[PDB]
Amino acid sequence: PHCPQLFADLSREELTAVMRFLTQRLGPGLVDAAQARPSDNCVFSVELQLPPKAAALAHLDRGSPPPAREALAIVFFGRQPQPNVSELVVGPLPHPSYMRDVTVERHGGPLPYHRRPVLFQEYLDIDQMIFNRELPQASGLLHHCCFYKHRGRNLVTMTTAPRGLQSGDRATWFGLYYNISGAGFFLHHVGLELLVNHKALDPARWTIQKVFYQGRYYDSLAQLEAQFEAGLVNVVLIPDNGTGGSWSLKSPVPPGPAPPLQFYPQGPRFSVQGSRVASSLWTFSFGLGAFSGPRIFDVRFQGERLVYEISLQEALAIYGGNSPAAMTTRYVDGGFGMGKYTTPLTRGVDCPYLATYVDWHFLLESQAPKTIRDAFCVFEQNQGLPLRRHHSDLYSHYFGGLAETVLVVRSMSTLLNYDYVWDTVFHPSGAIEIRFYATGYISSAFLFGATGKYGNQVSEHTLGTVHTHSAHFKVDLDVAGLENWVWAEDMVFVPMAVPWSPEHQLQRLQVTRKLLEMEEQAAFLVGSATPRYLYLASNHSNKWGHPRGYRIQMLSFAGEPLPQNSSMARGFSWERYQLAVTQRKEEEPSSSSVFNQNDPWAPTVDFSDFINNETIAGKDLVAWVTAGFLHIPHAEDIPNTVTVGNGVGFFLRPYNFFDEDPSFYSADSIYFRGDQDAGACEVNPLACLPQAAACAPDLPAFSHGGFS
Amino acid sequence: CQLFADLSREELTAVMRFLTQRLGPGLVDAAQARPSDNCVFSVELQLPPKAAALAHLDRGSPPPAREALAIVFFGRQPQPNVSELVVGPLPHPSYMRDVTVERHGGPLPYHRRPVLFQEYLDIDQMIFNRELPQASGLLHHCCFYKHRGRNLVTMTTAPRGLQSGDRATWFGLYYNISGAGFFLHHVGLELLVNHKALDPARWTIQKVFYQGRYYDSLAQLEAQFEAGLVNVVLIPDNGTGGSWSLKSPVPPGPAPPLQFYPQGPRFSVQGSRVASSLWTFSFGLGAFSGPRIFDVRFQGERLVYEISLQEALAIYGGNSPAAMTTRYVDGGFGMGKYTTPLTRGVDCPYLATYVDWHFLLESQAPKTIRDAFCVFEQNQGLPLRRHHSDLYSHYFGGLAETVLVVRSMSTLLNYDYVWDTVFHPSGAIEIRFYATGYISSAFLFGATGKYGNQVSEHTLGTVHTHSAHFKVDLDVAGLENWVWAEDMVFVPMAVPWSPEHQLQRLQVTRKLLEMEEQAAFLVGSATPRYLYLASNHSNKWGHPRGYRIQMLSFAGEPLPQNSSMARGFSWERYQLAVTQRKEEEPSSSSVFNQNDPWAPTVDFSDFINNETIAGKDLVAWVTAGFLHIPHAEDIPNTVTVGNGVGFFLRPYNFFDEDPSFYSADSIYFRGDQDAGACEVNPLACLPQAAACAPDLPAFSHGGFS
Numbered sequence A: 001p002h003c004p005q006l007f008a009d010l011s012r013e014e015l016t017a018v019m020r021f022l023t024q025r026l027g028p029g030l031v032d033a034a035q036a037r038p039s040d041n042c043v044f045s046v047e048l049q050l051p052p053k054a055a056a057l058a059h060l061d062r063g064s065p066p067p068a069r070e071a072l073a074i075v076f077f078g079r080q081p082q083p084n085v086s087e088l089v090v091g092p093l094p095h096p097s098y099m100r101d102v103t104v105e106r107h108g109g110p111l112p113y114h115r116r117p118v119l120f121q122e123y124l125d126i127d128q129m130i131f132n133r134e135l136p137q138a139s140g141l142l143h144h145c146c147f148y149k150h151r152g153r154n155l156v157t158m159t160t161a162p163r164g165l166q167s168g169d170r171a172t173w174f175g176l177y178y179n180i181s182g183a184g185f186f187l188h189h190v191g192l193e194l195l196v197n198h199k200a201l202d203p204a205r206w207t208i209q210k211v212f213y214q215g216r217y218y219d220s221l222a223q224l225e226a227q228f229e230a231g232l233v234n235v236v237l238i239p240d241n242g243t244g245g246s247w248s249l250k251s252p253v254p255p256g257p258a259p260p261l262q263f264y265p266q267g268p269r270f271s272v273q274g275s276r277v278a279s280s281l282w283t284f285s286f287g288l289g290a291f292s293g294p295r296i297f298d299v300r301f302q303g304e305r306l307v308y309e310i311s312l313q314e315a316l317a318i319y320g321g322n323s324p325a326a327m328t329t330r331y332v333d334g335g336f337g338m339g340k341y342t343t344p345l346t347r348g349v350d351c352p353y354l355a356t357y358v359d360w361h362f363l364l365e366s367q368a369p370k371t372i373r374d375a376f377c378v379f380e381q382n383q384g385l386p387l388r389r390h391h392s393d394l395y396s397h398y399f400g401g402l403a404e405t406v407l408v409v410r411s412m413s414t415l416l417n418y419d420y421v422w423d424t425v426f427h428p429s430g431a432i433e434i435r436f437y438a439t440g441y442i443s444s445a446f447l448f449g450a451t452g453k454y455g456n457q458v459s460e461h462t463l464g465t466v467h468t469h470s471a472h473f474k475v476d477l478d479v480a481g482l483e484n485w486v487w488a489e490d491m492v493f494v495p496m497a498v499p500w501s502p503e504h505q506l507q508r509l510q511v512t513r514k515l516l517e518m519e520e521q522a523a524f525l526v527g528s529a530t531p532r533y534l535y536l537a538s539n540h541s542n543k544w545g546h547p548r549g550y551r552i553q554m555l556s557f558a559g560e561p562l563p564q565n566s567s568m569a570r571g572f573s574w575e576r577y578q579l580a581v582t583q584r585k586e587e588e589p590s591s592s593s594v595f596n597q598n599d600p601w602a603p604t605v606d607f608s609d610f611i612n613n614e615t616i617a618g619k620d621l622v623a624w625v626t627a628g629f630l631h632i633p634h635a636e637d638i639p640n641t642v643t644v645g646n647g648v649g650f651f652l653r654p655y656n657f658f659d660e661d662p663s664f665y666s667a668d669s670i671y672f673r674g675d676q677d678a679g680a681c682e683v684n685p686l687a688c689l690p691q692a693a694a695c696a697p698d699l700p701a702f703s704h705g706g707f708s
Numbered sequence B: 001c002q003l004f005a006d007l008s009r010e011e012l013t014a015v016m017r018f019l020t021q022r023l024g025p026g027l028v029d030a031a032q033a034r035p036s037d038n039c040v041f042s043v044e045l046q047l048p049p050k051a052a053a054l055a056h057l058d059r060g061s062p063p064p065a066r067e068a069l070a071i072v073f074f075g076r077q078p079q080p081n082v083s084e085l086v087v088g089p090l091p092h093p094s095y096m097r098d099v100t101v102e103r104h105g106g107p108l109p110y111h112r113r114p115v116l117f118q119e120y121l122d123i124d125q126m127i128f129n130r131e132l133p134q135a136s137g138l139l140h141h142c143c144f145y146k147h148r149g150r151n152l153v154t155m156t157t158a159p160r161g162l163q164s165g166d167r168a169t170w171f172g173l174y175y176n177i178s179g180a181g182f183f184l185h186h187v188g189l190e191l192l193v194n195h196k197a198l199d200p201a202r203w204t205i206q207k208v209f210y211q212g213r214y215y216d217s218l219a220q221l222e223a224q225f226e227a228g229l230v231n232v233v234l235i236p237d238n239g240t241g242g243s244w245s246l247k248s249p250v251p252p253g254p255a256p257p258l259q260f261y262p263q264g265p266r267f268s269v270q271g272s273r274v275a276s277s278l279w280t281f282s283f284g285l286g287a288f289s290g291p292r293i294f295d296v297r298f299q300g301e302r303l304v305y306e307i308s309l310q311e312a313l314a315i316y317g318g319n320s321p322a323a324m325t326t327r328y329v330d331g332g333f334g335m336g337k338y339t340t341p342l343t344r345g346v347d348c349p350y351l352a353t354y355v356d357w358h359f360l361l362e363s364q365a366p367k368t369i370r371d372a373f374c375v376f377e378q379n380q381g382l383p384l385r386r387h388h389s390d391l392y393s394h395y396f397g398g399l400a401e402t403v404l405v406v407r408s409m410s411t412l413l414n415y416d417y418v419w420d421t422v423f424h425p426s427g428a429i430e431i432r433f434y435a436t437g438y439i440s441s442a443f444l445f446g447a448t449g450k451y452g453n454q455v456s457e458h459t460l461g462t463v464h465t466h467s468a469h470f471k472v473d474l475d476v477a478g479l480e481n482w483v484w485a486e487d488m489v490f491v492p493m494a495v496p497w498s499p500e501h502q503l504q505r506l507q508v509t510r511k512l513l514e515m516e517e518q519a520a521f522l523v524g525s526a527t528p529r530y531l532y533l534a535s536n537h538s539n540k541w542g543h544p545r546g547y548r549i550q551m552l553s554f555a556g557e558p559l560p561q562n563s564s565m566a567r568g569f570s571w572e573r574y575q576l577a578v579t580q581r582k583e584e585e586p587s588s589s590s591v592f593n594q595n596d597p598w599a600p601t602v603d604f605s606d607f608i609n610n611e612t613i614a615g616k617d618l619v620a621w622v623t624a625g626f627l628h629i630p631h632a633e634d635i636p637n638t639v640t641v642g643n644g645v646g647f648f649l650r651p652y653n654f655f656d657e658d659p660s661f662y663s664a665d666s667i668y669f670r671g672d673q674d675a676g677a678c679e680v681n682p683l684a685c686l687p688q689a690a691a692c693a694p695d696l697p698a699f700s701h702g703g704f705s
């Protein structure tokens, strides 16, 4: 037969109610953001305002009234003598009655308007400008190089970031690419890039500050056109069609025998109800910051809270290149938004077929809430590898082991060319693992000139541009309580005389232990040595008299960070650190800001500031982990970068936290002596598997929903 | 719903038969050999010369002679020695060549021979019959000892002494715990047994250590106990829970997830050869050096001639003399020899292909380890690549990652090494190893803080490092290889279009590493972010075709070079080395290193001299490991979570594009297309195609020796 909420993101209803309250208080001249002009008032985003920790915990611990459910709305105030962007807390939910400007309280004064994210409508006006007023002037050149037609629109633009060279600039370098049918346009740079100054509040005043074409600078398109017609521009002909991996994603090889499949022979061993996940071992709440991405709250292992908050905070790509676009590209992805750019998960490709798929709701650049279908997936995965194992042939014949099954929570952000995969993995040892992967397409530029310093040629006329990937996580561990310390354990060798034979030397291996007392002592720069055992500990001990701890262990090949002399470095100064442990502060909720991208020269949040002459001995601590790598593009990144070897992140592992390994108590654990029948059901639960897994896997009909 | 094959039963028998005929009548079963006997310690495959092997595989030349190497212990003579002997050809042997002098410049001294099972038996006889009864009163009081009873067991350490020629071993004493690890039950007694002499009657106890103090003899200890001076802490010999058993007190609940092949397996295993639609190779197990893979071909093209384990090292610290001087060089026992059956559904997925291993080690007749290897495909539950497009053109393109895995496990006393080789559909190869099983422990006394944590009652979990050394013979698009270092750098320059401003210009650095010394990277050094071996020829895009080495290691501080034993495993000092592959440099270690690290039989650092690595047959040597400070969570066993180290071999301008583009299992659809129609998406076709009840063979277990 067939085989058998404090931290929740705002629901459709809640988002609706906040919008309804905003469309009353803000006046009648309020424009839908999807069609808003720079000089308009519009609501850019509405999402959950995470509750204050003390009121949150008091509710969860002794059942005090929950803190008010609040939303944070980012409003673009364009229709006034001095335009600003404002942050507005609306509450309470479900029935809003107040709205409070927290801009000044948070930033010391107005959020300057040029720090606002570029709207969808703004990109549309930029395209309206480029395609209708600007490219027509180079009609001749474009006709010859680029299969251009009168109306046509066979070329497309791609933004870079940041937009200019100092605070208050809003000049973006746009590259132009063949609009490729059914596949990545990013590998088909026509060799034209345009510096667009789109700062003015009236789009009529927008200009092209500069042009770059196949290696050369021009002051305008007209000048380029006139030089082309005069005979002085030798056009390399880039083709707009072809076959293979640089043109397509469709495999020409027909499917063969089916890949292995995983299934739950007695049904799933976990539930998802709203935003909460529960298995026999793990409890937590998941969700998605619109800008800062995937997050989990209130992580309890076997009933005991380990973590207040694990959350993605920011992601960063720094480029090099032969052309202006890639030369100055520094993406601070939160400026676009990891939640906002979250995409549907393809059942059976993005996650295992039998995962539980959850929808995500949002109110971003519109006036009515929307849905991303299957934005999350939650599943148990058998690793195909033991958790623990011992086969004993010595003195006593017995085997004892357990196969490892993990519980996973995944979402994916597709920002322009690449696809970020965010995993949180829950281990039965009580370990928590965070990993991210950068797959999808690379950015490329038109190949010209001396190759070697900026990436490799990856296809016809195209250079895969060198860059680094980095991401920053907030890890607010509360190890057996709020109050934590930080320990550094490592090793050393001390030469001393062999006690029983003094004329001989031995190297005595010893453990070193240092309490890290001030924040600076727990700030570890990229490229420097970190102690082999770094852990946050409670004050209290386990049965064996050792402080109960959780170790932070890093898996990162960090790229060299942008040098400090850069005037924009402070816009993502978290990149300089592998790790930092600070006092958790209500007024330091994020290491980044949606506002940093378009003005890193005057950052809205500067992570450096968090690290000051401050004690970390007996405080509520949060660790901040940077994970990343250099990526020099190469042929086998075409058509897509693979995930193998490119998964960076960290482990959180119990270190004298328990009195013994919790998995000793696993229900799935296997043991038998050499003098009993390992083939019998009373002895080995794995022997009942032939019988107790002889059903046909229960599989839903395949459905995919989401192309906005 | 075969050049590289380990010797078979018949072949082992034939070499053994040939040896008994040719070595004369003085030959005794090694199973009961006295130190002064002649006996055969082992017989296994002699790997074939590379040139000839390639000649056969690529040019169709006659296969090289099938040969065995037999290690013989020549104890029955005025100058005792151990000899390595080449015997061939197979199937019907005809010659016996002594290669000892040839390989080592001189005879192998006898004190280098690994300790025999029989030698361990005699040591126990001495201990339990002649030695321990002298402290009978104390043992009765502390340790539930009974006259002519063996409720205690011993455990060897290594190396055995302080200088070349010694053979004195510290043995700890433990409760013989029934059905669980005896290692967590140190009784506090350790004895330094001098067993150098060829006549066991002349063996001695050089030192005693009991509950934190030294004594000259078991007799002085006993007298001092009877005299009222020795305060004996009482260690119990029974209990419940993790430090006493491995059996969960919790009943099974719902079944954990299980992987099956909807239309049967997608790879074959024939003898020692595996083949899938992407990969071809041969696997085996060296008696001493462990798991190896040979002739790895991706889609028909050889990436690697040999990838093999070479050595595993555990360096201990502690309160007691045993822990204090333990430096296990595990090849001196044998990662092959101590290979153990894999338990179906725990050690590997239930539906893996399982393979036996044959060996002739310390006996007259070959034996088998059942289910020694497992091969299987595994759905990672992760995409290999993926792109969802909402921009300009609406489409999805992706592929779930399935990998192919060869796995073996060796149990050397307390620990279980898991050796994984993973073959990815992108053309990458991954080597990982895990250390699980029991920790080694000592009786707890004095200042806790410097040698590990208390992990259970009366028990110190002793601090130690793990390391393993791998041989990686990449032949990147041919024998002649070069080594490239790529990395990144920022150069300040004025913005071309706005020279009043500065940018940080990101650039790639590139350097050719021409000499061996340039490609030797000591532990704790930074290495080039992109390090790769490359052919001389280019991919379609003008770039030298290369395979990069990416390392994942938290390596421990190596034993200080100032230690007179450090040369017995000098590979510990390196993360990575690249040398000319030479026929006289087949291993970075040796079975004889464990009992004489002071005068090593192979010294790895010797392979690194002033030689060129520019257009030669290159081999990369990779070290991986970590520091392990035991903690409560290691009880009963150390879990494998995040405790896997090793490396990736990943294509870097090797192909003209990512091979996975051509994958049979890749998926694609547009927004105008029907994502749920089967002709479009072969994944909408899986629910009904996987409506079969999976055929699970009845559970069997490999057994116990």
Ligand SMILES: *[C@H]1O[C@H](CO[C@H]2O[C@@H](C)[C@@H](O)[C@@H](O)[C@@H]2O)[C@@H](O[C@@H]2O[C@H](CO)[C@@H](O[C@@H]3O[C@H](CO)[C@@H](O)[C@H](O[C@H]4O[C@H](CO)[C@@H](O)[C@H](O)[C@@H]4O)[C@@H]3O)[C@H](O)[C@H]2NC(C)=O)[C@H](O)[C@H]1NC(C)=O
Residues within 6 Å of the ligand: A483, A539, A540, A541, A618
């Ligand atoms: C680990 O920590 C907890 C609490 O952690 C805080 O402890 C305090 C003392 C600070 O160090 C703070 O930074 C830590 O984070 C320990 O539990 C506390 O233990 C102290 C013992 O000193 C308790 O404080 C005492 O309370 C009594 C009354 O109950 C008072 O009479 C004492 O106050 C006198 O002494 C001070 C000296 O500066 C004078 O200023 C006063 O005027 C008084 O004369 C004294 O402060 C405290 O209440 C405990 N807190 C809790 C919540 O239990 C815990 O012992 C420790 N655990 C381990 C295993 O180390």
Ligand SMILES: *[C@@H]1O[C@H](CO)[C@@H](O[C@@H]2O[C@H](CO)[C@@H](O[C@@H]3O[C@H](CO)[C@@H](O)[C@H](O)[C@@H]3O)[C@H](O)[C@H]2NC(C)=O)[C@H](O)[C@H]1NC(C)=O
Residues within 6 Å of the ligand: A025, A026, A077, A080, A083, A084, A085, A086, A101, A103, A104, A109, A110
């Ligand atoms: C950024 O822009 C916002 C929106 O323009 C500014 O807040 C707005 O301030 C005005 C004047 O203080 C408020 O309008 C009304 O003014 C009259 C006339 O005195 C007063 O009697 C009314 O009660 C009312 O306050 C308006 O409510 C307020 N907008 C909201 C809803 O917050 C803001 O001051 C600017 N930021 C900074 C820091 O300058």
Ligand SMILES: *[C@@H]1O[C@H](CO)[C@@H](O[C@@H]2O[C@H](CO)[C@@H](O[C@@H]3O[C@H](CO)[C@@H](O)[C@H](O)[C@@H]3O)[C@H](O)[C@H]2NC(C)=O)[C@H](O)[C@H]1NC(C)=O
Residues within 6 Å of the ligand: B023, B074, B077, B081, B082, B083, B098, B100, B101, B106, B107
């Ligand atoms: C390590 O020990 C072995 C065994 O003692 C030594 O090898 C043996 O060396 C003797 C030479 O004294 C060989 O004897 C010769 O045997 C042939 C039989 O074909 C006989 O016709 C000769 O007259 C002579 O007696 C003996 O065969 C050989 N054993 C084998 C089978 O190798 C070896 O020399 C020692 N290692 C070193 C380097 O000292």
Ligand SMILES: *[C@H]1O[C@H](CO[C@H]2O[C@@H](C)[C@@H](O)[C@@H](O)[C@@H]2O)[C@@H](O[C@@H]2O[C@H](CO)[C@@H](O)[C@H](O)[C@H]2NC(C)=O)[C@H](O)[C@H]1NC(C)=O
Residues within 6 Å of the ligand: B480, B536, B537, B538, B614, B615, B616
């Ligand atoms: C890459 O190398 C191969 C082999 O080149 C050999 O040439 C020697 C001078 C020396 O550097 C040695 O290390 C190296 O292995 C080149 O083919 C060789 O060179 C030419 C062919 O153009 C002929 O003399 C031989 O066919 C051949 N030699 C051997 C020994 O095979 C090849 O040209 C070169 N390719 C590139 C792109 O550099």
Ligand SMILES: *[C@@H]1O[C@H](CO)[C@@H](O[C@@H]2O[C@H](CO)[C@@H](O)[C@H](O)[C@H]2NC(C)=O)[C@H](O)[C@H]1NC(C)=O
Residues within 6 Å of the ligand: A153, A154, A156, A179, A180, A181, A182, B392, B393, B394, B670, B671, B672
């Ligand atoms: C670029 O070309 C694509 C084709 O790849 C165009 O996509 C179609 O556009 C129409 C009108 O918007 C849709 O109704 C079709 O369903 C689209 N096809 C697909 C597969 O998405 C697109 O219009 C072009 N875009 C630009 C910016 O010119």
Ligand SMILES: *[C@@H]1O[C@H](CO)[C@@H](O[C@@H]2O[C@H](CO)[C@@H](O)[C@H](O)[C@H]2NC(C)=O)[C@H](O)[C@H]1NC(C)=O
Residues within 6 Å of the ligand: A395, A396, A397, A398, A673, A674, A675, B150, B151, B152, B153, B176, B177, B178, B179
């Ligand atoms: C250690 O204790 C074990 C378990 O009690 C003993 O092993 C058993 O011995 C009997 C008789 O020799 C065998 O038939 C059984 O197969 C063994 N049991 C198991 C579970 O393997 C062993 O003899 C003791 N060893 C000593 C005395 O050192």
Ligand SMILES: *[C@@H]1O[C@H](CO)[C@@H](O)[C@H](O)[C@H]1NC(C)=O
Residues within 6 Å of the ligand: A241, A242, A243
């Ligand atoms: C692109 O190339 C293919 C040939 O493979 C051709 O059939 C197709 O029509 C081309 N695309 C368009 C619409 O220009």
Ligand SMILES: *[C@@H]1O[C@H](CO)[C@@H](O)[C@H](O)[C@H]1NC(C)=O
Residues within 6 Å of the ligand: A613
């Ligand atoms: C940190 O704090 C103390 C003041 O209590 C002071 O002595 C010291 O100057 C500070 N250290 C640093 C590094 O600034």
Ligand SMILES: *[C@@H]1O[C@H](CO)[C@@H](O)[C@H](O)[C@H]1NC(C)=O
Residues within 6 Å of the ligand: B178, B238, B239, B240
């Ligand atoms: C140890 O004690 C338990 C009860 O606590 C008992 O059931 C068990 O049989 C004992 N184990 C042995 C092998 O003595």
Ligand SMILES: [Ca+2]
Residues within 6 Å of the ligand: A519, A582, A583, A609, A610, A611, A612, A614
């Ligand atoms: Ca601070």
Ligand SMILES: [Ca+2]
Residues within 6 Å of the ligand: A308, A476, A477, A478, A479, A482, A484, A584, A620, A621, A622
């Ligand atoms: Ca905390």
Ligand SMILES: [Ca+2]
Residues within 6 Å of the ligand: B305, B473, B474, B475, B476, B479, B481, B581, B617, B618, B619
């Ligand atoms: Ca080679």
Ligand SMILES: [Ca+2]
Residues within 6 Å of the ligand: B516, B579, B580, B606, B607, B608, B609, B611
């Ligand atoms: Ca050399």
Ligand SMILES: [Cl-]
Residues within 6 Å of the ligand: A113, A114, A199
């Ligand atoms: Cl502005």
Ligand SMILES: [Cl-]
Residues within 6 Å of the ligand: A505, A506, A507, A508, B563, B565
């Ligand atoms: Cl030493």
Ligand SMILES: [Cl-]
Residues within 6 Å of the ligand: B080, B110, B111, B196
């Ligand atoms: Cl000897």
